[PDB]
């Protein structure tokens, strides 16, 4: 099979071997990649190993081609020529080839391990194709490292159509994916070598699995299968569609006297109208999730697909459309997994309707007329590429605020990421500014919003409310037991145990904590509805019991504190341990 080079888009057939995603690579580009980095394996239509009965020389600059096979220096034929000569690697389309200087960033992209915080910076300023490749290999490396695998061995061979499986107890097990691979690990003495590449789909009877392998060797008794490497889908669409500026309204049909609430944003609906993609930035609780419904009721005859990376944002959008949009044809899309509960009050799973509600990983391959991507703060470049490849519409709407939380990025454990480096849309809205804006708080009271209007924003955000003076600030140890590598604080839930009996107006409160373990154990202790900082973004909460547990770089960030505190529409109790963060808040001091 042939393909296109990454950094020059020329026709080629030389895959690199030691790159994590197994991409297609050029001739001169591959020469520069394997002559400067530690990657030495290259996959042509046949692998570039030596063809001696016993020999392992997989480096390409090192072999010779004689006859029709690849031979080493010791096993070279009298008539041959080395593969890596004249600055290129031997492959198809030899002199129809052009190179570039994108290898200086390509080498660093393919060489890094994505635990640093500078490679993430590099993955967002270079050209578009290298951006896509960097995101793809980010997802691949994440799937390799985090939640890796459990060791599995085969007890006996029943047949070549159905296999036997035995998971090692003590570690979990990844399920079927043809995208997943279990590399053969007969590791004993005795050929600790790749014996093939396998995936496993299970049967409905007995202890059997009907596998799919890519090798023609029978299994040994000691052969193992531990999941190393994963193949994600090679998306093609760019992160952002190129901008085109319009003069009059195209593809959309405005309404006169639309309503009373959306009358302030009518000029906003035009400026959404005559641009290809428009961006909205605003502090939380200002109406970003309301502007989508405003667009819907300003452009009534056009289909709009409403989609977000998570389910909570699309469900809050469901709620707002439920109160403002016609109930009769509105939609909601759930995946075939159906793992979690969704907003099942419209038509569930009707892709042909005018208002489609969905989540980025489960969109159908259909058209649209306006697309409104909600909360790009949850969006990476992968999700943007997904929505660009699957949804094909005249207008794109990107609404969100970088001051709220970025994507999890569980590999990121060192350094700090700026809001403008979360994705491409954040880089747009923080560098050249958002197209249009609102800042005015109608959600949290004047006290707590005045606190947060110095930490993340420096006094550009006022409020229209009172200082209700139940933002209680408490400072205690909260002895931390480190059980599940997720923080549990029994004395913190204890001071909260006995500060709920004194407050009769806080029996409807909601428990918030940046650690999922203590978060979950708080259910039986005190019985309040219980949510984490990550999943509570979007919905409005009357009373909030926020409980900061530990002192670290994980729970002491101002951003997650911002979203956890700003969801209390009338009052909040905050538990704490820090002293730089306590020095700047304006709360009741206890």
């Amino acid at each position: 099979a042939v393909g296109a080079c990454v950094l020059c888009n020329s026709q080629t057939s030389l895959r690199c071997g030691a790159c994590i995603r197994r991409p297609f690579l050029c001739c001169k580009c591959c020469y520069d990649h394997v002559i400067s980095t530690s990657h030495k394996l290259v996959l042509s239509v046949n692998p570039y190993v030596c063809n001696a009965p016993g020999c392992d020389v997989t480096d390409v600059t090192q072999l010779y081609l004689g006859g029709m096979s690849y031979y080493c220096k010791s096993h070279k034929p009298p008539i041959s020529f080395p593969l890596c000569a004249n600055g290129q690697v031997f492959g198809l389309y030899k002199n129809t080839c052009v190179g570039s200087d994108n290898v200086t960033d390509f080498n660093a992209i393919a060489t890094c391990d994505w635990t640093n915080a500078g490679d993430y910076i590099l993955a967002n300023t270079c050209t578009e194709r290298l951006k896509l490749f960097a995101a793809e290999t980010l997802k691949a490396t994440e799937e390799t490292f985090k939640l890796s695998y459990g060791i599995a061995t085969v007890r006996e061979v029943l047949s070549d159509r159905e296999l036997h499986l035995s998971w090692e107890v003590g570690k979990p097990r990844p399920p079927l994916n043809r995208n997943y691979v279990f590399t053969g690990y007969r590791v004993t003495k005795n050929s600790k070598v790749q014996i093939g590449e396998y995936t496993f789909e299970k049967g409905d009877y007995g202890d059997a699995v009907v596998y799919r392998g890519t090798t023609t060797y029978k299994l040994n008794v000691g052969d193992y299968f531990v999941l190393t490497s994963h193949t994600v889908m090679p998306l093609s669409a760019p992160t952002l569609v190129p901008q085109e500026h319009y003069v009059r309204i195209t593809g959309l049909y405005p309404t006169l006297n639309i309503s009373d609430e959306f009358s302030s944003n009518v000029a906003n609906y035009q400026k959404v109208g005559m641009q290809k993609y428009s961006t909205l930035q605003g502090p939380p609780g200002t109406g970003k999730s309301h502007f989508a419904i405003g667009l819907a009721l300003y452009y009534p005859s056009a289909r709009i697909v409403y989609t977000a990376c998570s389910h909570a944002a699309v469900d809050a959008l469901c709620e707002k459309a439920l109160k403002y949009l016609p109930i009769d044809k509105c939609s909601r899309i759930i995946p075939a997994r159906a793992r979690v509960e969704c907003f099942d009050k419209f038509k569930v799973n009707s892709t042909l309707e005018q208002y489609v509600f969905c989540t980025v990983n489960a969109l159908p391959e259909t058209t649209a007329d306006i697309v409104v991507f909600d909360e790009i703060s949850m969006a990476t470049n992968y999700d943007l590429s997904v929505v660009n490849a699957r949804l094909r519409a005249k207008h794109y709407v990107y609404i969100g605020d970088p001051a709220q939380l970025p994507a999890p990025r569980t590999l990121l454990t060192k350094g700090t990421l700026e809001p403008e480096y979360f994705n491409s849309v954040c880089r747009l809205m923080k560098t050249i500014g958002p197209d249009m804006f609102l800042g005015t708080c109608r959600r949290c009271p004047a006290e707590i919003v005045d606190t947060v209007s110095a930490l993340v924003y420096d006094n550009k955000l006022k409020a229209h409310k009172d200082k209700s003076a139940q933002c209680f600030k408490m400072f205690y140890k909260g002895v931390i037991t480190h059980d599940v590598s997720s923080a549990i604080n029994r004395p913190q839930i204890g001071v909260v145990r006995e500060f709920l009996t004194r407050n009769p107006a806080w029996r409807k409160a909601v428990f918030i904590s940046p650690y999922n373990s203590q978060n979950a154990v708080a259910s039986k202790i005190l019985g309040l509805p219980t949510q984490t900082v990550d999943s509570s973004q979007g919905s409005e909460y009357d009373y909030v019991i926020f409980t900061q547990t530990t002192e670290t770089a994980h729970s002491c960030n101002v951003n997650r504190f911002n979203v956890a505190i700003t969801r209390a529409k009338v009052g909040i109790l905050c538990i704490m341990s820090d002293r730089d963060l306590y020095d700047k808040l304006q709360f009741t001091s206890l």
């Binding site: 042939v2 029709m68 593809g251 049909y253 309404t255 005859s301």
Partner: protein, 142 residues
């Protein structure tokens, strides 16, 4: 002479290798492109015809004036096409007549997205924004 002849055999065995190689690659090279690529062929070769009816029709399709059903060919048969702009109405509909596909049509419907029965006179310069765009026409062929 011996190794010269067996060298013949090596290059011809490579002829299998190369000819199989090219045929199989170009096989689903021809498969992967063709659908969108032969849509492009259809449009290039359609454009080569240069018939004013097809030109008029697909230049109206570009602006959004696409028909909602097949265009009938017998005299006095129903066609319904959506009007996306006042300029598009101004160019094609004059009086109660409707020129389209280089043919003459007279109006039965003008009707909007509200499905409200609408009559012919109010579509004018200063009354055009008052309309619920886009409008759907029903016409017969004269």
């Amino acid at each position: 002479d011996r190794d010269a002849a067996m060298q013949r055999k090596l290059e011809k065995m490579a002829d299998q290798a190369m000819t199989q190689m090219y045929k199989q690659a170009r096989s689903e090279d021809k498969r992967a492109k063709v659908t969108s690529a032969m849509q492009t062929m259809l449009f290039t070769m359609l454009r080569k015809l240069d018939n004013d009816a097809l030109n008029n029709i697909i230049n109206n399709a570009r602006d959004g004036c696409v028909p909602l059903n097949i265009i009938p060919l017998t005299t006095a048969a129903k066609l319904m096409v959506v009007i996306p702009d006042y300029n598009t109405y101004k160019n094609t509909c004059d009086g109660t007549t409707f020129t389209y596909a280089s043919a003459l049509w007279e109006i039965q419907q003008v009707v909007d997205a509200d499905s409200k029965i609408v009559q012919l006179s109010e579509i004018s310069m200063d009354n055009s924004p008052n309309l619920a765009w886009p409008l759907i026409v029903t016409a017969l062929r004269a």
